[PDB]
């Protein structure tokens with residue numbers, strides 16, 4: 001590989017972060033996935049503007065009651081995938097909080113993509129694409145909508161963040 | 169015992185149903201409890217107006233995407249404990265949906281108690297007591313606020329519903 005990019009997934013419990021990870025790195029999916037214990041990462045190589053980037057993608061539970069995610073999680077991260085659930089409006093609402101946590105724990109220069117995941121659930125939508133696109137644009141984040149379930153826009157979400165990072 | 173009363177817990181995922189149950193029947197609590205798989209029930213005997221009621225309390229996951237709770241869950245129930253989380257407004261919002269579900273699957277004569285649980289969590293309240301006390305009142309349900317963590321109002325919640333049922 002030519003460069004290593006550490007990227008982190010963050011977003012509320014249940015929005016689909018670990019299945020974004022597994023979709024991207026092993027092309028596997030799991031409808032019966034339990035809340036994530038401790039921290040995981042997995043790697044995959046791709047091609048970005050001619051180069052081989054090894055993407056190191058980190059993942060962990062969205063739950064922070066008694067046990068908070070520390071700076072060590074975010075340490076060295078060039079990209080954050082900030083995921084919410086298009087069908088549950090509270091998860092979009094908590095984006096603020098994740099931005100706050102990014103400001104708090106991550107580099108001032110982290111590239112942040114807002115990802116509205118679970119697009120297959122077209123009919124259950126509680127968050128309109130153009131509202132979120134406009135929230136992204138107003139906060140200076142990239143934006144995409146994915147489905148880890150039917151595998152739509154996943155490799156794109158990743159390739160885009162990784163390209164942005166490479167071109168900074 | 170002099171009577172058997174089947175009571176069901178219902179309410180969104182995570183509002184604290186299985187710990188209401190475990191608190192009530194074995195005085196045990198589990199901060200690390202995972203989402204309930206299949207159906208469970210457990211019993212405890214108490215005194216209601218001079219009589220020995222055996223309370224049979226049923227529980228199951230609040231999740232219904234691919235697998236819906238059927239009428240057999242509800243069959244024979246004289247009381248429902250309709251639980252939400254005082255710290256998550258969306259669980260209160262879905263009460264409408266649980267009432268709908270009571271109307272579809274349970275007896276027209278079921279006694280329903282609205283329980284706002286996780287009341288220790290005072291400082292993170294997203295649902296005002298009196299708004300809920302008045303939603304109960306407008307819908308002909310009883311109302312109580314509980315904490316399965318600090319034992320507050322748990323035995324009382326059960327004891328009041330069983331008393332309501334015994335007196336219909």
Ligand SMILES: Nc1nc2c(ncn2[C@@H]2O[C@H](COP(=O)(O)OP(=O)(O)OP(=O)(O)O)[C@@H](O)[C@H]2O)c(=O)[nH]1
Nearest residue numbers: 014015016017018019031035036061062147148149
């Ligand atoms: N419909 C649909 N469901 C999905 C999709 N991706 C994930 N899910 C489901 O959402 C549920 C939770 O997703 P997971 O990937 O664990 O959620 P996650 O953010 O790790 O959650 P935590 O580990 O608790 O922080 C699982 O049942 C997934 O199958 C998707 O693309 N479409």
Ligand SMILES: Nc1nc2c(ncn2[C@@H]2O[C@H](COP(=O)(O)OP(=O)(O)OP(=O)(O)O)[C@@H](O)[C@H]2O)c(=O)[nH]1
Nearest residue numbers: 182183184185186187199203204229230315316317
């Ligand atoms: N602070 C606080 N947390 C509670 C209380 N009761 C339950 N919890 C926590 O909420 C989380 C989930 O509660 P459980 O009782 O499984 O929720 P439940 O409705 O069975 O949820 P499902 O089985 O998924 O439908 C656990 O971490 C519990 O410890 C409470 O009274 N106070």
Ligand SMILES: [Mg+2]
Nearest residue numbers: 018035036060
């Ligand atoms: Mg996870």
Ligand SMILES: [Mg+2]
Nearest residue numbers: 185186204228
């Ligand atoms: Mg349960």
